[PDB]
Design a protein around this ligand. Structure first.
Ligand SMILES: CCCCCCCCCCCCCCCCCC(=O)OC[C@H](COP(=O)([O-])OCC(O)COP(=O)([O-])OC[C@@H](COC(=O)CCCCCCCCCCCCCCCCC)OC(=O)CCCCCCCCCCCCCCCCC)OC(=O)CCCCCCCCCCCCCCCCC
Ligand SMILES: CCCCCCCCCCCCCCCCCC(=O)OC[C@H](COP(=O)([O-])OCC(O)COP(=O)([O-])OC[C@@H](COC(=O)CCCCCCCCCCCCCCCCC)OC(=O)CCCCCCCCCCCCCCCCC)OC(=O)CCCCCCCCCCCCCCCCC
Ligand SMILES: CCCCCCCCCCCCCCCCCC(=O)OC[C@H](COP(=O)([O-])OCC(O)COP(=O)([O-])OC[C@@H](COC(=O)CCCCCCCCCCCCCCCCC)OC(=O)CCCCCCCCCCCCCCCCC)OC(=O)CCCCCCCCCCCCCCCCC
Ligand SMILES: CCCCCCCCCCCCCCCCCC(=O)OC[C@H](COP(=O)([O-])OCC(O)COP(=O)([O-])OC[C@@H](COC(=O)CCCCCCCCCCCCCCCCC)OC(=O)CCCCCCCCCCCCCCCCC)OC(=O)CCCCCCCCCCCCCCCCC
Ligand SMILES: CCCCCCCCCCCCCCCCCC(=O)OC[C@H](COP(=O)([O-])OCC(O)COP(=O)([O-])OC[C@@H](COC(=O)CCCCCCCCCCCCCCCCC)OC(=O)CCCCCCCCCCCCCCCCC)OC(=O)CCCCCCCCCCCCCCCCC
Ligand SMILES: CCCCCCCC/C=C/CCCCCCCC(=O)OC[C@H](COP(=O)(O)OCCN)OC(=O)CCCCCCC/C=C/CCCCCCCC
Lengths: 99, 50, 62, 50, 200
């Protein structure tokens, strides 16, 4: 088996240039917004989150940290001990984990 | 390992832990050797004293 | 002698043992490799003094 | 490999910790001793075969 | 002059052997003989004259007497090695003076330096490839044979031909150009915010 063998799952286009072998383009490559346009877009989100998204945050941060535990019995123990006796299914709806 | 790990493979755990010592005087030795190589280049080709 | 290896641990409690030998405050500003630099660099400094030996014979210094 | 110039035999003890239990100052004590016995081997051979 | 004997002894080494102090051991020249010089036969005649004067031209005395080696040539290879280590460039300069009286052109000198440095450059890359094979071996791939000149069904890369055509299109990978991404420095934002929260 050739040592420099690769199986690629996306289309690539190889340049037909002498002395060189490389991928010159990707088919149907769409260029998105620039780094500056993404920066202005992200700042609008972070500004709203700074101004109007900081009230009642400590409760949500405690619920999020409890759901990063390994077992479910430890999550319930975390909610009862740290989050003021919150319910498992009720806190999962707040965090958006419920279908 | 069961949730976030790979296959348990058997390897040989090397106890000897090599590490290149980052020294100061080793570059002085290197410059001296290159200073001799460059001086020989000047001694043979750019010496007009004879 | 096996009990002599644990002498500094008996006068301490577990919290004092951890705070003493385990929880060493992080300080990554020291020049740890100075030990190797002084030792190995001493070969070069020793050669500076050794190359000036008043030995008369050239082949004795060889 | 300690006597080779720019060795590429990286798997022949080049990247391993190799200490010994012989006399130190190797090229001053041990290596001349191996050469002294070499001279005896050939001088004894020359005397016998001749 | 005043400081001549002190300085001359300090600058150069003299011979310490007294090999020629013993009279009968002195060589007539038959130990190290020049074989190809145009006056070769004049050298042999002088050796024969030296042997005849020692025996008053009764060479039977030489046949019965003991023959000695040239004691003056003892340890001569070691003595040159020590001078080469003492002053390597001074030894090379004087040993090549007569050869360097004939200076080749700038082209020939450039070809010597170019091919010599080019050969050392390929040797350095060959050493670095051996470290790649050792890392491949430790990574779990046993290696039969050695080198990168693949006998089988594989692509080879011979190495940059040391001519300006390929040296303009290609250049070797500079390892110092492979860097940590600068986004690492954005983690320091965590430090500035923590310092303000703690009132530092
Ligand atoms: C006022 C007049 C005088 C009155 C007083 C007279 C009495 C004087 C003596 C008491 C005062 C001494 C002051 C210092 C206290 C030290 C005491 C001590 O016990 O040290 C033992 C000392 C260290 O013991 P050690 O642990 O065995 O270490 C040596 C090992 O070999 C090490 O081997 P290693 O493998 O373990 O490690 C490798 C080593 C590398 O070591 C080597 O490779 C050398 C190995 C030797 C050669 C190898 C062949 C071995 C030969 C074997 C036979 C030798 C036998 C000799 C026995 C002599 C006994 C004394 O590298 C290093 O470890 C680090 C080296 C670099 C560290 C920095 C060193 C700084 C030194 C001081 C700098 C300032 C001085 C000024 C500079 C000099 C003047 C221009 O042994 C020595 O004697 C070292 C001798 C080195 C040469 C010294 C020459 C200079 C002497 C200075 C004199 C004053 C200045 C001149 C004044 C001129 C007008 C008068
Ligand atoms: C008011 C007083 C003020 C002063 C107070 C203090 C006075 C001085 C007290 C000294 C205190 C002790 C000093 C400690 C500092 C040591 C620092 C150091 O660098 O040691 C490194 C050195 C190496 O040890 P190491 O590196 O640490 O390795 C650890 C183990 O050794 C490793 O074990 P290994 O088995 O693996 O090693 C193998 C072993 C190898 O096996 C051996 O041990 C070799 C032994 C064979 C030699 C034994 C015979 C030597 C004597 C021959 C001359 C005899 C003359 C009289 C004959 C009388 C006949 C009945 O070791 C070696 O490999 C040795 C190689 C290194 C040296 C070889 C070359 C040396 C240079 C030779 C030429 C010197 C030219 C002289 C120029 C003068 C200026 C430098 O340590 C020593 O060698 C200790 C030597 C102690 C002195 C020996 C006596 C020398 C006598 C010379 C006589 C000619 C001059 C007479 C002058 C008279 C003046 C009054
Ligand atoms: C029961 C318990 C005890 C058991 C003991 C058992 C052993 C018995 C002990 C005694 C054995 C010998 C018996 C007595 C022999 C006496 C003969 C005699 O009258 O003197 C002749 C001979 C005459 O020499 P010469 O006439 O003055 O000058 C030589 C010619 O002019 C030529 O000078 P050249 O300038 O033209 O240079 C060419 C020269 C040499 O030039 C070379 O190219 C040789 C280069 C060698 C050094 C380089 C080695 C390479 C690796 C290191 C690299 C160095 C790098 C340095 C540079 C740095 C990098 C750039 O060519 C030679 O090879 C001369 C060697 C002597 C001739 C013999 C026939 C040689 C053919 C065999 C060649 C293979 C062996 C070579 C070994 C060379 C050692 C000197 O003198 C000697 O051989 C002296 C040897 C006596 C030393 C005694 C030491 C104490 C004895 C006890 C030691 C304890 C050892 C324990 C061993 C333990 C077991 C492992
Ligand atoms: C080598 C034989 C096989 C080996 C077996 C061993 C044989 C036993 C003998 C070996 C012992 C002696 C070795 C040969 C020495 C040369 C003979 C000699 O001494 O004659 C006196 C000779 C005087 O020449 P001349 O015939 O009396 O008059 C010439 C006239 O000037 C003008 O004359 P022209 O107008 O009629 O023509 C111009 C030019 C004649 O044109 C040429 O010579 C063409 C030279 C073009 C470049 C050749 C590059 C050689 C390849 C080296 C690259 C690495 C090798 C591996 C890669 C390539 C693989 C093939 O003149 C010459 O250069 C005369 C030299 C011609 C014969 C020597 C050529 C040797 C080349 C090597 C052949 C292939 C070896 C393959 C390697 C094998 C390794 C396994 O001394 C010289 O000056 C010429 C030697 C070259 C000096 C060039 C300037 C070098 C300056 C370097 C400065 C930078 C150094 C910095 C210092 C270093 C740090 C401290
Ligand atoms: C106002 C007038 C103009 C201004 C005048 C002012 C000029 C001041 C002159 C002062 C001289 C320089 C003083 C210091 C030099 C001393 C050291 C030395 O190198 O002497 C060599 C010395 C003298 O050599 P030589 O055997 O007596 O031969 C002398 C002449 O070649 C003669 O012997 P030949 O007749 O047998 O030569 C025949 C010639 C026959 O040539 C031809 O017939 C036609 C040549 C056409 C050339 C075609 C060019 C093609 C270009 C294609 C480029 C493609 C790639 C480009 C890629 C770039 C990026 C895209 O072909 C050659 O072999 C020429 C030799 C190589 C020449 C290299 C430079 C060529 C261009 C010169 C630029 C100056 C233009 C001035 C305007 C002139 C207009 C009239 O010999 C030595 O090698 C010993 C020194 C060791 C040197 C080895 C290492 C050299 C590197 C360090 C050298 C020093 C630093 C660099 C200085 C400049 C060197 C290039
Ligand atoms: C006349 C003065 C000339 C001085 C030289 C001129 C050049 C000046 C340019 C210097 C720019 C300074 C940039 C910063 C350099 C950093 C130096 C350094 O890293 O030292 C580290 C480190 C400090 O150790 P730590 O406590 O573990 O680290 C604490 C870190 N806060 O220093 C050392 O390792 C000690 C070695 C210092 C250099 C070697 C000193 C010896 C030099 C030999 C000459 C001395 C002769 C006399 C010695 C007496 C011996 C008996």
């Amino acid at each position: 088996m050739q040592n420099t063998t690769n199986i690629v799952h996306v289309p690539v286009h190889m340049g037909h240039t002498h002395y060189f072998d490389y991928i010159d383009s990707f088919p149907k490559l769409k260029e998105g917004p620039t780094l500056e346009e993404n920066h202005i877009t992200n700042q609008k989100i972070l500004r709203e989150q700074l101004i109007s998204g900081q009230q009642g945050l400590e409760q949500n941060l405690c619920l999020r940290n409890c759901f990063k535990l390994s077992q479910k019995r430890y999550i319930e123990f975390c909610l009862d001990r740290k989050c003021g006796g919150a319910d498992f299914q009720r806190a999962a709806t707040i965090l958006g984990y419920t279908k | 390992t069961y949730f976030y790990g790979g296959i348990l493979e058997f390897v040989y755990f090397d106890k000897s832990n090599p590490d290149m010592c980052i020294l100061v005087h080793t570059l002085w030795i290197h410059l001296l050797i290159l200073f001799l190589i460059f001086t020989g280049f000047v001694t043979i080709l750019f010496s007009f004293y004879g | 002698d096996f009990a002599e290896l644990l002498r500094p641990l008996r006068s301490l409690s577990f919290n004092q043992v951890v705070d003493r030998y385990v929880l060493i405050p992080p300080n990554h500003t020291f020049y740890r490799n100075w030990t190797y630099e002084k030792f190995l660099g001493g070969f070069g400094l020793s050669y500076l003094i050794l190359r000036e030996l008043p030995l008369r014979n050239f082949y004795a210094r060889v | 490999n300690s006597a080779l110039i720019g060795s590429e035999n990286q798997s022949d003890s080049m990247n391993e910790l190799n200490t010994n239990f012989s006399m130190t100052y190797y090229i001053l004590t041990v290596l001349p001793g191996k050469f002294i016995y070499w001279i005896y081997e050939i001088l004894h051979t020359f005397f016998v075969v001749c | 002059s005043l400081h001549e004997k002190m300085q001359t002894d300090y600058l150069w080494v003299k011979d310490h052997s007294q090999a020629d102090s013993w009279a009968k051991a002195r060589t007539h020249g038959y130990n190290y003989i020049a074989h190809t010089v145009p006056n070769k036969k004049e050298r042999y005649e002088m050796i024969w004259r030296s042997m005849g004067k020692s025996t008053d031209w009764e060479l039977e005395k030489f046949r019965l007497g003991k023959k000695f080696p040239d004691r003056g040539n003892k340890r001569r290879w070691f003595k040159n090695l020590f001078r080469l280590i003492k002053n390597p460039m001074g030894y090379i300069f004087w040993k090549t003076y007569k050869a360097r009286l004939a200076k080749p052109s700038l082209i020939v000198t450039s070809m010597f330096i170019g091919f010599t440095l080019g050969f050392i450059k390929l040797k350095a890359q060959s050493i670095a490839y051996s470290k790649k094979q050792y890392a491949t071996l430790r990574a779990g791939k046993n290696i039969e044979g050695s080198g990168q000149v693949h006998f089988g069904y594989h692509d080879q890369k011979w190495g940059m031909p040391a001519i300006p055509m390929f040296q303009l299109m290609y250049y070797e990978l500079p390892g110092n150009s492979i860097v940590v991404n600068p986004c690492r420095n954005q983690n320091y934002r965590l430090y500035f915010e923590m310092r303000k929260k703690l009132g530092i």
